[PDB]
Amino acid sequence: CGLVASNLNLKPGECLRVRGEVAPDAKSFVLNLGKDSNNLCLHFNPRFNAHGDANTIVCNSKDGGAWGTEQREAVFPFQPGSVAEVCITFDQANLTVKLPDGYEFKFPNRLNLEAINYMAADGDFKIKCVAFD
Amino acid sequence: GLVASNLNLKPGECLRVRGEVAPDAKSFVLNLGKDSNNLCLHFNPRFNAHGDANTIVCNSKDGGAWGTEQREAVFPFQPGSVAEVCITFDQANLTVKLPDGYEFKFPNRLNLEAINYMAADGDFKIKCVAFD
Ligand SMILES: OC[C@H]1O[C@H](Sc2cc(Cl)c(F)c(Cl)c2)[C@H](O)[C@@H](n2cc(-c3nccs3)nn2)[C@H]1O
Ligand SMILES: OC[C@H]1O[C@H](Sc2cc(Cl)c(F)c(Cl)c2)[C@H](O)[C@@H](n2cc(-c3nccs3)nn2)[C@H]1O
């Protein structure tokens, strides 16, 4: 139900910046990147209290519609109600995610896409702006 | 160019779009509406295209059919430059604010509850989009 954008043509090394406001009663939110809705090089899913987890970032891939292996992070710099900006870039080996407090983590590049063409937002986060390199 | 959907832009809300006009630009397009066949605003600055030079052409599209064109008398765009446009609407008009602060109105002929669809085309690369 959040924004869906296509034809992004984000190349390796280029930065996608997304700013939004976390809902005051947020359970979780999602940013999806990839080729299309069924082929995601990154599903980024901060969980405040959702899907079994509390204050945990869960990332995954999706390939031909099938979820890959989950990856959980050790940090959670989100707060209900607060503005948050996330920055994402990739190379052939990994995506690098930069979180609102400057913390960076890597997620393996599983799909080998030439470019990221698709983004989508969902859950308890209102997008305020998106910047493309 | 970029296509966005599920924008849920409500009356009174501002959409800001910043992009790069190509150095050899002929024209560019920003479309807003419900879907590609139902546009409350087709915003088409023509440098040299479609018969016009340095002219903004606007139109609507309804069930795939173009409406009556409107042309502006000012052209604050330059090839090979960054350009920003800001758009809002109410039931009567869309209001477009151009890079030099010039504003004009375009009648709202579809009376959509919300703008859900945006697309860019031609010689413009979107760099940033904001919703406030
Ligand atoms: O791995 C990422 C996913 O985990 C589970 S499904 C699942 C569960 C298990 Cl135990 C797994 F082993 C695998 Cl591989 C997947 C979520 O339900 C999914 N999810 C959240 C959401 C939204 N959250 C807010 C708006 S939409 N939409 N889909 C996704 O985050
Ligand atoms: O009115 C808006 C349009 O005018 C003509 S069609 C037209 C012509 C006349 Cl004489 C009319 F009386 C009417 Cl009602 C329509 C353009 O060809 C269209 N157009 C531009 C473009 C692109 N330009 C860059 C990339 S895609 N793709 N379609 C559209 O701008």
Swiss-Prot record, chain B:
Coiled coil: none annotated. The modification Phosphoserine is found at residue 27. The keyword DNA-binding does not apply. One of its GO terms (cellular component) is collagen-containing extracellular matrix. This is Galectin-1. The modification N6-acetyllysine is found at residues 10, 26, 105, 125. A beta-D-galactoside binds at residues 42-46, 50, 59, 66-69. Residues 1-132 form the Galectin domain. One of its GO terms (molecular function) is lactose binding. Homodimer. Binds LGALS3BP. Interacts with CD2, CD3, CD4, CD6, CD7, CD43, ALCAM and CD45. Interacts with laminin (via poly-N-acetyllactosamine). Interacts with SUSD2. Interacts with cargo receptor TMED10; the interaction mediates the translocation from the cytoplasm into the ERGIC (endoplasmic reticulum-Golgi intermediate compartment) and thereby secretion. Interacts with CD69. It is found in: Secreted, Extracellular space, Extracellular matrix; Cytoplasm; Secreted. The modification N6-succinyllysine is found at residue 105. Keywords: Acetylation, Apoptosis, Cytoplasm, Extracellular matrix, Lectin, Phosphoprotein, Secreted. The gene is LGALS1. InterPro entries: ConA-like_dom_sf (IPR013320), Galectin-like (IPR044156), Galectin_CRD (IPR001079). One of its GO terms (biological process) is myoblast differentiation. It comes from Homo sapiens (Human). CDD domains: GLECT.
